[PDB]
Amino acid sequence: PLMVKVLDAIRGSPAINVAVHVFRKGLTTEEEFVEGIYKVEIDTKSYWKALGISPFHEHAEVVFTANDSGPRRYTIAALLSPYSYSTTAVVT
Amino acid sequence: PLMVKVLDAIRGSPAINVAVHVFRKGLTTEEEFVEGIYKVEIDTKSYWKALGISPFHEHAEVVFTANDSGPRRYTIAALLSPYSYSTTAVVT
Amino acid sequence: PLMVKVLDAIRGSPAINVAVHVFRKGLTTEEEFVEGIYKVEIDTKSYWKALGISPFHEHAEVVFTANDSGPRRYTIAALLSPYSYSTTAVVT
Amino acid sequence: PLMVKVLDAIRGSPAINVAVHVFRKGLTTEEEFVEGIYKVEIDTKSYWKALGISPFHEHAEVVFTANDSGPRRYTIAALLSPYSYSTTAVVT
Amino acid sequence: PLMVKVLDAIRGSPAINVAVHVFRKGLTTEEEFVEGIYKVEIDTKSYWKALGISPFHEHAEVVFTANDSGPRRYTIAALLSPYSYSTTAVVT
Amino acid sequence: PLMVKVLDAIRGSPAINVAVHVFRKGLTTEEEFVEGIYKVEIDTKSYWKALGISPFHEHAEVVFTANDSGPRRYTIAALLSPYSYSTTAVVT
Numbered sequence: 232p233l234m235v236k237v238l239d240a241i242r243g244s245p246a247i248n249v250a251v252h253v254f255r256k257g258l259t260t261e262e263e264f265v266e267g268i269y270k271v272e273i274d275t276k277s278y279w280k281a282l283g284i285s286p287f288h289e290h291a292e293v294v295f296t297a298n299d300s301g302p303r304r305y306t307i308a309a310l311l312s313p314y315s316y317s318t319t320a321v322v323t
Numbered sequence: 324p325l326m327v328k329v330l331d332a333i334r335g336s337p338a339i340n341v342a343v344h345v346f347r348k349g350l351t352t353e354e355e356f357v358e359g360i361y362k363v364e365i366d367t368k369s370y371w372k373a374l375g376i377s378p379f380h381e382h383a384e385v386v387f388t389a390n391d392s393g394p395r396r397y398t399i400a401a402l403l404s405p406y407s408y409s410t411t412a413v414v415t
Numbered sequence: 416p417l418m419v420k421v422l423d424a425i426r427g428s429p430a431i432n433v434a435v436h437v438f439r440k441g442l443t444t445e446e447e448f449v450e451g452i453y454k455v456e457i458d459t460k461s462y463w464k465a466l467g468i469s470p471f472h473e474h475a476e477v478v479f480t481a482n483d484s485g486p487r488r489y490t491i492a493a494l495l496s497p498y499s500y501s502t503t504a505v506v507t
Numbered sequence: 508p509l510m511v512k513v514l515d516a517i518r519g520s521p522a523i524n525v526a527v528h529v530f531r532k533g534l535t536t537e538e539e540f541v542e543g544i545y546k547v548e549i550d551t552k553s554y555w556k557a558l559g560i561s562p563f564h565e566h567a568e569v570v571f572t573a574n575d576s577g578p579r580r581y582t583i584a585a586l587l588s589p590y591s592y593s594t595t596a597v598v599t
Numbered sequence: 600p601l602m603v604k605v606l607d608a609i610r611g612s613p614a615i616n617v618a619v620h621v622f623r624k625g626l627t628t629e630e631e632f633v634e635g636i637y638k639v640e641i642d643t644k645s646y647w648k649a650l651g652i653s654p655f656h657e658h659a660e661v662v663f664t665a666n667d668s669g670p671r672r673y674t675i676a677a678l679l680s681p682y683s684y685s686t687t688a689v690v691t
Numbered sequence: 692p693l694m695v696k697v698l699d700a701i702r703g704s705p706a707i708n709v710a711v712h713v714f715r716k717g718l719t720t721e722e723e724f725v726e727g728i729y730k731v732e733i734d735t736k737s738y739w740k741a742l743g744i745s746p747f748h749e750h751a752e753v754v755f756t757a758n759d760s761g762p763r764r765y766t767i768a769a770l771l772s773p774y775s776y777s778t779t780a781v782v783t
């Protein structure tokens with residue numbers, strides 16, 4: 232007998248991010264995968280991935296140049312941080 | 324007997340993001356995959372992915388230039404952060 | 416016997432994003448995939464994906480230039496953050 | 508008999524990020540993998556990954572240049588830090 | 600009989616990040632792996648990973664240059680640090 | 692009989708990061724691995740990893756240059772340090 236009881240008595244006004252998970256039992260392969268329960272990506276860049284089988288196999292000349300140079304201002308007050316009876320703010 | 328009881332007694336006015344999941348049992352392959360329960364992507368860039376089988380196999384000349392240079396201001400007060408009886412704000 | 420009871424007693428005025436999921440049992444392939452329960456994408460760019468089988472196989476000259484340079488102001492007060500009895504605002 | 512009781516008596520207004528997980532039993536391969544319970548990535552860049560089988564197998568000349576040089580100001584007040592009866596703020 | 604009771608009596612307004620996990624029983628391979636309970640990555644860069652089988656097998660000339668030189672100011676007040684009745688702030 | 696009771700009597704407003712884990716029983720391989728309970732990485736860079744089987748097997752000339760030279764100011768007030776009734780701040 233598998234019993235799971237979570238947040239049974241929520242009183243007043245709490246801030247909660249609950250993620251309950253119960254389980255009873257050619258190039259890339261993923262099986263029985265759980266992902267992104269609470270994934271947060273900012274400025275994530277993948278230039279080349281999984282090009283393929285036999286890419287540039289023979290006589291190949293390749294020039295790769297990656298220049299990251301930008302005035303980007305990523306300003307996040309709260310990330311994955313539930314709050315209660317609080318004062319949160321951003322001032323510029 | 325598998326019993327799952329979540330947030331049974333919600334009193335007052337809480338802020339909650341609950342994600343319950345119960346399970347009882349040529350190039351890219353994904354099987355039985357759960358993803359994006361709460362995925363948040365900002366400025367995510369993939370230039371080349373999974374080009375293919377035999378890409379640029381022979382006698383190939385390739386020039387790749389990636390120039391990221393932009394005045395972007397990504398301003399997010401709250402992300403994945405439920406709040407209660409709070410004062411949240413953005414001021415410019 | 417699989418029983419799942421969620422948010423059984425919602426009292427007052429809570430803010431909730433609940434996603435319950437119960438399961439009992441040539442190039443890209445996805446099987447039994449759950450995605451986008453709560454996916455939020457901002458400024459997500461994929462230049463080239465899955466070009467194909469035998470792309471630019473022989474004698475191919477390719478010039479790729481990616482220039483990201485724009486005055487974009489992405490201003491989001493609340494994202495995936497349910498709120499209650501709160502004051503949220505944006506001021507410019 | 509497996510019984511799991513979590514956050515049974517939530518009184519007042521707490522801020523909580525709870526993630527309960529109960530389990531009873533050619534190039535890349537992942538099996539029975541749980542990931543991203545609470546993953547937060549900022550400025551994560553992978554230039555080349557999983558190119559493929561036999562890439563640049565013979566007579567290949569490749570020049571790779573990676574120049575990261577940008578005035579980026581990543582300013583995050585709270586990350587994965589739930590708060591209560593607090594005052595959080597950003598001032599410029 | 601396996602019984603796990605956590606945070607049974609939450610009184611007042613605590614800030615908690617609880618992660619309970621109970622378990623009863625060609626190149627890269629991962630099995631029964633749990634990861635990212637609370638993973639936070641900042642400025643993590645992998646230039647080349649898992650290139651592939653037989654990469655640059657014969658007669659290959661490769662020049663790799665990695666130049667990290669950028670005025671980036673990563674300013675994070677709180678990371679994975681729940682707080683209560685506190686005053687947290689950033690001032691420039 | 693295995694019984695685990697944690698944080699049974701939480702009084703007032705504590706700040707806690709609790710992670711309870713109970714278990715009862717070609718190149719890289721990981722089995723039954725738990726990782727990232729609370730992993731925090733800043734400026735972690737891996738230039739080359741797991742290139743592959745037979746990489747640069749014969750007649751290979753490779754020049755590798757890694758130049759890390761950037762005015763980066765990583766300023767983190769609190770990391771993995773829950774606080775209570777405290778005043779934390781950053782001033783420039």
